[PDB]
Amino acid sequence: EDEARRFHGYFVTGTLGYIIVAAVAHFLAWQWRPWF
Amino acid sequence: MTEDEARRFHGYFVTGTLGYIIVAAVAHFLAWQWRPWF
Amino acid sequence: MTEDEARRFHGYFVTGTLGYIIVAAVAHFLAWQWRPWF
Amino acid sequence: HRIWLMFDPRRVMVAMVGFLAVLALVIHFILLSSQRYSWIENGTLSAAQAPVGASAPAA
Amino acid sequence: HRIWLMFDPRRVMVAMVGFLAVLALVIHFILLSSQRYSWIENGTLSAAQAPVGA
Amino acid sequence: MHRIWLMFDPRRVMVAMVGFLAVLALVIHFILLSSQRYSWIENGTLSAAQAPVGAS
Amino acid sequence: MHRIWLMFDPRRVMVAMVGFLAVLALVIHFILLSSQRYSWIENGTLSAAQAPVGASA
Amino acid sequence: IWLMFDPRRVMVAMVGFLAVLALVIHFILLSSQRYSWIENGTLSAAQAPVGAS
Amino acid sequence: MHRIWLMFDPRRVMVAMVGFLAVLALVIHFILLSSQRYSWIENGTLSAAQAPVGASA
Amino acid sequence: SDIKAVPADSYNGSALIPTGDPMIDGVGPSSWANRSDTPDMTFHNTAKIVPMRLDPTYSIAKGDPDPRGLPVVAADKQVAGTVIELWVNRAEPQVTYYEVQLTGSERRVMLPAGFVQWPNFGLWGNDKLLVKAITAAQFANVPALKRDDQITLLEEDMVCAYYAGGHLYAMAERSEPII
Amino acid sequence: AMLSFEKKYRVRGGTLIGGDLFDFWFGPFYVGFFGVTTIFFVTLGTLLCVWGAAMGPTWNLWQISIAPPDLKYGLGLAPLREGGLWQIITLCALGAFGSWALRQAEISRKLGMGMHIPWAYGGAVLAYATLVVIRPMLLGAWGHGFPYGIFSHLDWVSNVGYQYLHFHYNPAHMIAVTFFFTNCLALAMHGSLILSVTNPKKGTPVGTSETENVFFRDLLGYSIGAIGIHRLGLFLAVGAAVWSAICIVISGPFWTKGWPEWWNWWLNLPI
Amino acid sequence: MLEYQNLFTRVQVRTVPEAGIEIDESTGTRYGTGTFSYLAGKFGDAQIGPIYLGWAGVLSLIFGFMAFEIIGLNMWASVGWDPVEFIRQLPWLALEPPPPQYGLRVPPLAQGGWYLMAGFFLTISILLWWVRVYRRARALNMGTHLPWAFASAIFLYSTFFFQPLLVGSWSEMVPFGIFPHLDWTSAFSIRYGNLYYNPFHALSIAFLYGSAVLFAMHGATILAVARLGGEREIEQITDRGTAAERSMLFWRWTMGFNATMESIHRWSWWFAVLTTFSGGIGILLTGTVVDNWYLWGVKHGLVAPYPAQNTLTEEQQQLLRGRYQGTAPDSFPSY
Amino acid sequence: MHRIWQGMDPQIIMSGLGFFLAGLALIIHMWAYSITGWPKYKKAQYNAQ
Amino acid sequence: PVDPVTGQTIINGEPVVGRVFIMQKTDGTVKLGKWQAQYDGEPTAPEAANV
Amino acid sequence: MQYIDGAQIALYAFWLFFFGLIIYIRREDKREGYPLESPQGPREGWPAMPEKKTYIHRPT
Ligand SMILES: CCCCCCCCCCCCCC(=O)OC[C@H](COP(=O)(O)OCC(O)COP(=O)(O)OC[C@@H](COC(=O)CCCCCCCCCCCCC)OC(=O)CCCCCCCCCCCCC)OC(=O)CCCCCCCCCCCCC
Ligand SMILES: CCCCCCCCCCCCCC(=O)OC[C@H](COP(=O)(O)OCC(O)COP(=O)(O)OC[C@@H](COC(=O)CCCCCCCCCCCCC)OC(=O)CCCCCCCCCCCCC)OC(=O)CCCCCCCCCCCCC
Ligand code: BCL
Ligand code: BCL
Ligand SMILES: CC[C@H]1c2cc3[nH]c4c(c3C)C(=O)[C@H](C(=O)OC)c4c3nc(cc4[nH]c(cc(n2)[C@@H]1C)c(C(C)=O)c4C)[C@@H](C)[C@@H]3CCC(=O)OC/C=C(\C)CCC[C@H](C)CCC[C@H](C)CCCC(C)C
Ligand SMILES: CC(C)=CCC/C(C)=C/CC/C(C)=C/CC/C(C)=C/CC/C(C)=C/CC/C(C)=C/CC/C(C)=C/CC/C(C)=C/CC1=C(C)C(=O)c2ccccc2C1=O
Ligand SMILES: COC(C)(C)C/C=C/C(C)=C/C=C/C(C=O)=C/C=C/C(C)=C/C=C/C=C(C)/C=C/C=C(\C)CC/C=C(C)/C=C/C=C(\C)C(=O)O
Ligand SMILES: COC(C)(C)C/C=C/C(C)=C/C=C/C(C=O)=C/C=C/C(C)=C/C=C/C=C(C)/C=C/C=C(\C)CC/C=C(C)/C=C/C=C(\C)C(=O)O
Numbered sequence A: 001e002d003e004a005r006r007f008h009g010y011f012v013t014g015t016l017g018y019i020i021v022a023a024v025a026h027f028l029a030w031q032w033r034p035w036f
Numbered sequence B, C: 001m002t003e004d005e006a007r008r009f010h011g012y013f014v015t016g017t018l019g020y021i022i023v024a025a026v027a028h029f030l031a032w033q034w035r036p037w038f
Numbered sequence D: 001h002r003i004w005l006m007f008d009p010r011r012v013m014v015a016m017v018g019f020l021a022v023l024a025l026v027i028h029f030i031l032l033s034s035q036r037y038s039w040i041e042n043g044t045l046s047a048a049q050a051p052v053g054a055s056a057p058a059a
Numbered sequence E: 001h002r003i004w005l006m007f008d009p010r011r012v013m014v015a016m017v018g019f020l021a022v023l024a025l026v027i028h029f030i031l032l033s034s035q036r037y038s039w040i041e042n043g044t045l046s047a048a049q050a051p052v053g054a
Numbered sequence F: 001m002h003r004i005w006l007m008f009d010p011r012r013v014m015v016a017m018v019g020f021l022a023v024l025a026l027v028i029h030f031i032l033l034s035s036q037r038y039s040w041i042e043n044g045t046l047s048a049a050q051a052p053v054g055a056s
Numbered sequence G, I: 001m002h003r004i005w006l007m008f009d010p011r012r013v014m015v016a017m018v019g020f021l022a023v024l025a026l027v028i029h030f031i032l033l034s035s036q037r038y039s040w041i042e043n044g045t046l047s048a049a050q051a052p053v054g055a056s057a
Numbered sequence H: 001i002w003l004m005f006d007p008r009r010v011m012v013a014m015v016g017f018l019a020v021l022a023l024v025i026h027f028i029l030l031s032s033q034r035y036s037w038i039e040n041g042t043l044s045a046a047q048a049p050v051g052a053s
Numbered sequence J: 001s002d003i004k005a006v007p008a009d010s011y012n013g014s015a016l017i018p019t020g021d022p023m024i025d026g027v028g029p030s031s032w033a034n035r036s037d038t039p040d041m042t043f044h045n046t047a048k049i050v051p052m053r054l055d056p057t058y059s060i061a062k063g064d065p066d067p068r069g070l071p072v073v074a075a076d077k078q079v080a081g082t083v084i085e086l087w088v089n090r091a092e093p094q095v096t097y098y099e100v101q102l103t104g105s106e107r108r109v110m111l112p113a114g115f116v117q118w119p120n121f122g123l124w125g126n127d128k129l130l131v132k133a134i135t136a137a138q139f140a141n142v143p144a145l146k147r148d149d150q151i152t153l154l155e156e157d158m159v160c161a162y163y164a165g166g167h168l169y170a171m172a173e174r175s176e177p178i179i
Numbered sequence K: 001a002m003l004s005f006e007k008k009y010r011v012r013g014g015t016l017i018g019g020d021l022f023d024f025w026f027g028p029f030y031v032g033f034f035g036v037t038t039i040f041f042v043t044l045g046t047l048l049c050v051w052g053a054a055m056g057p058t059w060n061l062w063q064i065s066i067a068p069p070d071l072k073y074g075l076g077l078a079p080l081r082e083g084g085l086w087q088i089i090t091l092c093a094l095g096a097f098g099s100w101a102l103r104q105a106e107i108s109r110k111l112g113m114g115m116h117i118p119w120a121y122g123g124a125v126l127a128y129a130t131l132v133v134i135r136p137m138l139l140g141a142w143g144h145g146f147p148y149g150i151f152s153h154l155d156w157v158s159n160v161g162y163q164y165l166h167f168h169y170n171p172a173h174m175i176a177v178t179f180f181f182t183n184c185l186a187l188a189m190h191g192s193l194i195l196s197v198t199n200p201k202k203g204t205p206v207g208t209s210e211t212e213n214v215f216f217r218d219l220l221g222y223s224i225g226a227i228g229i230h231r232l233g234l235f236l237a238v239g240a241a242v243w244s245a246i247c248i249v250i251s252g253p254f255w256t257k258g259w260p261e262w263w264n265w266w267l268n269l270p271i
Numbered sequence L: 001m002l003e004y005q006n007l008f009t010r011v012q013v014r015t016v017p018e019a020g021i022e023i024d025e026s027t028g029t030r031y032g033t034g035t036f037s038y039l040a041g042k043f044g045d046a047q048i049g050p051i052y053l054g055w056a057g058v059l060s061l062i063f064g065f066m067a068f069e070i071i072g073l074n075m076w077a078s079v080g081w082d083p084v085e086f087i088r089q090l091p092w093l094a095l096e097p098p099p100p101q102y103g104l105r106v107p108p109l110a111q112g113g114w115y116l117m118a119g120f121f122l123t124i125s126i127l128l129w130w131v132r133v134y135r136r137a138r139a140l141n142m143g144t145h146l147p148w149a150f151a152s153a154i155f156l157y158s159t160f161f162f163q164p165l166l167v168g169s170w171s172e173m174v175p176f177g178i179f180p181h182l183d184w185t186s187a188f189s190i191r192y193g194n195l196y197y198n199p200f201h202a203l204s205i206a207f208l209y210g211s212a213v214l215f216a217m218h219g220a221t222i223l224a225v226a227r228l229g230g231e232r233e234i235e236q237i238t239d240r241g242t243a244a245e246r247s248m249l250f251w252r253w254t255m256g257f258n259a260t261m262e263s264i265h266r267w268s269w270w271f272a273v274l275t276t277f278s279g280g281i282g283i284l285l286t287g288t289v290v291d292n293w294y295l296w297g298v299k300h301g302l303v304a305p306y307p308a309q310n311t312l313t314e315e316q317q318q319l320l321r322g323r324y325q326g327t328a329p330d331s332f333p334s335y
Numbered sequence M: 001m002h003r004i005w006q007g008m009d010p011q012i013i014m015s016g017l018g019f020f021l022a023g024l025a026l027i028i029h030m031w032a033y034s035i036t037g038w039p040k041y042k043k044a045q046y047n048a049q
Numbered sequence N: 001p002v003d004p005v006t007g008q009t010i011i012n013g014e015p016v017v018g019r020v021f022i023m024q025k026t027d028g029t030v031k032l033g034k035w036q037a038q039y040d041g042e043p044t045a046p047e048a049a050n051v
Numbered sequence O: 001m002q003y004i005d006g007a008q009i010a011l012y013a014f015w016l017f018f019f020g021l022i023i024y025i026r027r028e029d030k031r032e033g034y035p036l037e038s039p040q041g042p043r044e045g046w047p048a049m050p051e052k053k054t055y056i057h058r059p060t
């Protein structure tokens, strides 16, 4: 369906944005107080 | 619900979300000046 | 529930709230004379 | 003034009387529980002998 | 007055009698167990001899 | 800006707003009453220099 | 963003997000109030140098 | 791809799981000694607590 | 080994296995967290030579 | 369209006031649900609720009074009729209905067994059937059945609803507050 | 909002106190005179509970405790800060529970139903009243009641139980515990039976009322009726509360020694 | 005078006893034809009908009777085989677990061996009864909800075996006795520091009270609409009548939300099952993860503060320290 | 080699690229702050006097 | 400190009008802390069992 | 770690399961009598309406 191809693009973009905003957060926390 | 009303609602919803986040950012700036947590 | 019939109840309600608040203000003045809280 | 078309005046009156009764009783009871304003026991004290609370760690 | 057109007298006065009785009982009972106004025990004391909370 | 009243009717909004505001006000007043610095029924008449402060 | 309101009810989303944000704000404010460093009702007048700090190694 | 799973249910479940997991991790960190950031967040990495050897 | 999907519903199998795998991951992570040697939140900064070891008998 | 009840006022949440007779109109506690117009069946595809005359195997346990030939006293302490037949539930053996012949006869009405009380809670002499909900005059308005050998679920609900609604709509002092 | 079938049932009449004034619906709730009274008592009692929490040393939900007065104030209204607040909260709770029962009676009188639900709730109300009114009156002090706190009332239960050395030996406590356990067992059986008949083995039709009786007759040899199981559940659940009230009201007012010693009568039978 | 409360039935109707739905009878059969009890018919159904017996039921009966016989004979031997003392002291008698010093090793026959035999046989019979319940359910094409509720009950029962195994001693098991098993309950709470502060114990208490609440509510609701045909819940579920509609509306108007005629039984099922499930978890956690529940409650902020009732001096704190309980004296000293 | 774009909304590509570049720039800026010792030394200069 | 002339309580160098009392919560209760602090003032740990 | 212990972890696992169970039972509670009747249109609380469920009947 066309729907499962237009919705999919926005879902993938949102997932990527969320994941790598989380990556920024983890890098900040590592600089502040590393856990390893 | 059709496309036009969805667009008109989306504009206001996005503006409200971003404005609320900006106001919370100012609140966090004030709290940081008062007593920083890092 | 006409306009003419809501206006009357609004007048009495506003006068009653007026009077109640003023009488309570007098009570607080008397209580302040007896034992102030600030 | 047209608020009485959206709300029943009778129900509003009952609700307001109930709310004011509860608030008045709660405030009078809170004051009765206090030390400075337990007027049944210490109402005859002047304002210069009425209790005033102070901090324990700073005492 | 027109309030009796909005509120039935029979119901209103029964409710007010109940509330008034409850309030009077609560006040009398609060006074009865206080130190200053325990009139069943210390009602014969004068106003100078009556207890005063510190 | 008035179209919100076409999505949320005024009656329910006013009832919810009144209830939430009352609960929040009572909660804040009670939190202040339970504290040492703002127990105004007891201290109340103390000046700002005499009021309690939390430990450093 | 293209088809999020034909697919999700705006009224439902508004009510749910208002409830979630109210609960989260209450939880954060209460966590801060329960702490020692950020018990602002009692020690809010302290400067940042006098505020309590947790124990160090 | 998104034909055998009803994207709506997927999104609600994913949001709920992510919120629960984030709350759990944040609270576990808040209950620890090394990462009790409300109280000891101003300490440097050298002054932060470390578990016993 | 392919014709199991005409014999087992793919959707129910995937839901069951994702649930089982998530439960297993949580259980293992929490067991490791409750141990002495792998309490990585507290002692993750220790080197492998300073990490706790069970009593040698 | 079939809700014979006008709102008291325009404020939402207000109670409705029936226009005609609530008992037959079907409003308030006199209302019934539109169930299927087929009889209730047993495990063997037989009518579940049947008169005792249609099944000779059933009987009345020794020790229990026989309600047949007993007067049925109504809410107004007026005898409305006499019991002439018992409808029983075949799946679960119990008394479910009482067929009552009217004082003027010529017709019969169904009386649910759950609305029937016995004198002295069935401890002392049981010589009359007490029905506190409906008065004697209203027994003539109990909805009739299509057949005399089976009763559908719709008729079941209709009869039960009519009898239940008379705990509020029989007299005038019943729908009115005690003070 | 309203259910699909709700509208035809929302009519006037059936109230005990009041008329058309208190005969409306606030959202899904029905408001009567006793609904208004319930709101009044609930609000006053809850606000006084919050005040008692504010007076105490903590805001922790588990540790909040509003305690009854000392025994020395016997049957008198103690000072508010020394247990009188507990007494006022108790009065509010009694009013609220009575109003809840009467409002339920009004609602059942409006749908054409029987009066069973208010009377069933009356058993729990009677147990609470025995705890805070009847037993403290017989013992002669309001300080015999239990404190209002999530875990402090557990401490009260523990100490009151050990006031009689071994509270397990209370015969009425044993009967009440049996009632509770049998009620839980019967509830599990009834829920399972109904669900298994309406949700049978996949591919098979929905079972009938004879299937229930046949199953329980095959398993236990006896099957109580469809009406019988509901009668039994009501009797078990309400009797648990009634026997709880009996068990607590005999400890202190009637028996002051250790409960095990009470079994002397059984060991001293003439046989 | 009063409305018919549907509490008792005045007119009973008799018929030929119901033989039962045709079921497979290759491994077991139905015994009896079906008799009628008048007193039982007053309150509910009157037929004391046939009972099915098969492999699992017979085996369960044999094992359970063996456990019952072992328990009873040990109780009888504990009073010196006196029948008068056996009946008089029956609530105080017990079959006692082994001594603590044996751990998990087999004890002497007169000092806990009989206890373990009886426990094993009782466990086997309970599991065989579970199999019988499952088979009786599936023979009538019903769902297996009752088997999985009985499984929750069995889980709580099996924690009384698994917790003593986890702490490492059969002495911690529950004795077979009316009063002594209550003694064990009290001593278990005392030993591990006030089981009131076990969160899963509090949870299971909440579910037990809620089961009583739910059954009172459901029974009163169905009895209140039985005049409208409400007790026939299957038909009210598959064809919703006015009784189900009124039952829903009563609770919707009362507490603002409601269930359906079918999902109220889901509520009941889950409350009853959770009562034993959370309790079993709480028992399994005791003595293995937490040894003092009051101290766990203090750690997690569960314990309300009270003013100190006593203060101890420096020498009193050393003096008032005691000693952990040890073994009983095996000699009668002469002084 | 321009046909990879066929079938994709350009705005989605630009949004994903912007997210990538924002996160990468933030991470590498923090990395470089730690490596170079800036602005710590200049901040120390302006706070010492 | 108390003013030796007017008999008035002084708080941070300021006199107070009234009878100053030290505020406390209900019946002088204090929130509990760590579980290990439950043994401050209690007797030391009991000795090992006699077996 | 030190503050976290097995009883706490198990308790929060139970809380999560209990909330999921309450959601499921509330989903079942709306199988009859929904959607609600309101002037603003059809109404569904949380959780939303479930899919239509049909039963199986024996042939005649
Ligand atoms: C735990 C889970 C939670 C869960 C919480 C979240 C979920 C809640 C779900 C609740 C059920 C479903 C929703 C629903 O239908 O709700 C009913 C109502 C819509 O009602 P409706 O369908 O329009 O039907 C109303 C109809 O009956 C018409 O009523 P009318 O408008 O004529 O008036 C009825 C009432 C109100 O009277 C008014 O005048 C209303 C406006 C003024 C209110 C305050 C008046 C008092 C003075 C100021 C106080 C305030 C001053 C600041 O009139 C009555 O008589 C009814 C009330 C009782 C009166 C007797 C008692 C008197 C004493 C009361 C003392 C205490 C209260 C003050 O809906 C709404 O209002 C929508 C918004 C939701 C409201 C509740 C929000 C609660 C927020 C709580 C936040 C904190 C949580 C911890
Ligand atoms: C002695 C030791 C034991 C001691 C303690 C023992 C406790 C026992 C607990 C038992 C729980 C279920 C109770 C029950 O209703 O049983 C009846 C049913 C038998 O029914 P039937 O004879 O087949 O009848 C057929 C039909 O009538 C069933 O209809 P009914 O209405 O009874 O059941 C409705 C079904 C509908 O199923 C669905 O819609 C499919 C999806 C169900 C959920 C799947 C995922 C669950 C989570 C997985 C991770 C779970 C991780 C924990 O529904 C049910 O039976 C249960 C409905 C859900 C109940 C609440 C779930 C809440 C979950 C919250 C999660 C957290 C959210 C934040 O028995 C069953 O076992 C049903 C399930 C049978 C299929 C296998 C399921 C498991 C497959 C994977 C393991 C395979 C073996 C190794
Ligand atoms: C020690 C390191 C050196 C230095 C070395 C370099 C080098 C080497 C390079 C840069 C580059 C750049 N540097 Mg640098 N840089 C320094 C200090 C700074 C400072 C500063 C005030 O300290 C600033 C503002 C900048 C700015 C910049 C950018 C113009 C540019 C990266 C662009 C890009 O792709 O963005 C990403 C593009 C976007 C559209 C996203 C921007 C995202 C923002 C930053 C995210 C945070 C804000 C957030 C959205 C706000 C809303 C949310 C909340 C409400 C708060 N530099 C110091 C002196 N910098 C790079 C470049 O291209 O230079 C020409 C590069 O290679
Ligand atoms: C001083 C005593 C302690 C205490 C110690 C304990 C202990 C110890 C336990 C409980 C447990 C429970 N307690 Mg207690 N409890 C106290 C105070 C209370 C109070 C109160 C008002 O004070 C209440 C209401 C409760 C209530 C509860 C229940 C919620 C729970 C048990 C459910 C249950 O048994 O189902 C009944 C179900 C079963 C017993 C399951 C097994 C049934 C089996 C399958 C049946 C087999 C029958 C067999 C075939 C028959 C024949 C035998 C013949 C010999 C052949 N406790 C205090 C604090 N409590 C239990 C629990 O779960 O705790 C977490 C538990 O073990
Ligand atoms: C949801 C949890 C609740 C629950 C659920 C539950 N229990 C269940 C079930 C369910 C759903 C069943 O399916 C199952 C059952 O069949 O119930 C009818 C069962 C059951 N719950 C039982 C009991 C029970 N349940 C309890 C508790 C509860 N069960 C919880 C509250 C308790 C308590 C409170 O302690 C008990 C005692 C049984 C009735 C039954 C399981 C039967 C079983 O396993 O039997 C095995 C068989 C034997 C042990 C044979 C014994 C034979 C005789 C007892 C001895 C010999 C007698 C002699 C012949 C005559 C007399 C002596 C002579 C000298 C006179
Ligand atoms: C013959 C024989 C053998 C007898 C043996 C029986 C024996 C021995 C029994 C023991 C006897 C003894 C001594 C026991 C004492 C029993 C007592 C004290 C009896 C109480 C009588 C009784 C019926 C109980 C309660 C009375 C009731 C129901 C009161 C209601 C009165 C009424 C209708 C008025 C409404 C006002 C009320 C109820 C007040 C609450 C109320 C208040 C106060 C508002 O301000 C308010 C404002 C706005 C909105 C709402 C409210 C609101 O709800
Ligand atoms: C102690 O530390 C712990 C706490 C443990 C760690 C924390 C952990 C966690 C997990 C935190 C979670 C954070 C989080 C997750 O992302 C938080 C997520 C936050 C989010 C998304 C906020 C978004 C808010 C958006 C708002 C307010 C929008 C408002 C819109 C308005 C006002 C306009 C609408 C009006 C209209 C449209 C009218 C027109 C009508 C029209 C036209 C009409 O109707 O016609
Ligand atoms: C310890 O500290 C804590 C406690 C914590 C701190 C507390 C904090 C808080 C939260 C305080 C809240 C305060 C508050 C607001 O929220 C308080 C709000 C007060 C208000 C609004 C009071 C209003 C009173 C109104 C009155 C009395 C009106 C009477 C009207 C009359 C008599 C007219 C009727 C006449 C009629 C009918 C005849 C005409 C009929 C006609 C013509 C007809 O018949 O038609």
Ligand SMILES: COC(C)(C)C/C=C/C(C)=C/C=C/C(C=O)=C/C=C/C(C)=C/C=C/C=C(C)/C=C/C=C(\C)CC/C=C(C)/C=C\C=C(/C)C(=O)O
Pocket (backbone or CB within 6 Å): A006, A007, A008, A010, A011, A014, A015, A018, A019, G001, G002, G003, G004, G007, H007, H018, H024, H025, H028, I022, I025, I026, I029, I030, I033
């Ligand atoms: C102590 O340590 C312990 C904790 C124990 C160790 C931990 C262990 C474990 C088990 C960790 C688990 C990790 C994990 C996996 O399990 C982690 C999994 C993470 C994942 C996958 C995250 C993905 C997030 C995706 C998001 C946010 C997407 C948002 C999408 C948006 C905004 C776009 C929506 C809008 C659209 C599409 C518009 C069109 C709609 C249209 C057209 C329409 O709808 O019609």
Ligand SMILES: COC(C)(C)C/C=C/C(C)=C/C=C/C(C)=C/C=C/C(C)=C/C=C\C=C(C)\C=C\C=C(C)\C=C\C=C(C)\C=C\CC(C)(C)OC
Pocket (backbone or CB within 6 Å): L068, L069, L071, L072, L073, L075, L076, L106, L116, L117, L119, L120, L123, L157, L158, L160, L161, L173, L174, L175, L176, L177, L178, L181
């Ligand atoms: C006429 O007299 C005779 C003697 C002929 C018959 C009369 C009998 C009478 C009067 C019997 C009376 C019985 C009574 C009063 C019984 C009371 C029982 C009670 C109250 C029991 C309560 C609780 C008991 C519990 C919870 C016991 C649980 C035991 C468990 C879980 C044991 C498990 C053991 C296992 C699995 C053992 C395994 C064997 C291993 C593997 C360890 O082998 C080495």
Ligand SMILES: CCCCCCCCCCCCO[C@@H]1O[C@H](CO)[C@@H](O[C@H]2O[C@H](CO)[C@@H](O)[C@H](O)[C@H]2O)[C@H](O)[C@H]1O
Pocket (backbone or CB within 6 Å): K119, K122, K123, K126, K175, K238, K239, K242
């Ligand atoms: C082994 C011994 C026998 C065990 C079984 C005993 C069976 C009988 C006891 C259980 C039933 C007791 O029966 C009980 O009767 C009393 C009247 O006294 C009823 O009434 C009681 O509760 C109601 C509820 O509000 C109160 O209004 C009333 O004042 C009070 O007496 C109870 O609702 C009913 O539960």
Ligand SMILES: [Fe+3]
Pocket (backbone or CB within 6 Å): K190, K194, L218, L222, L233, L265
């Ligand atoms: Fe039922």
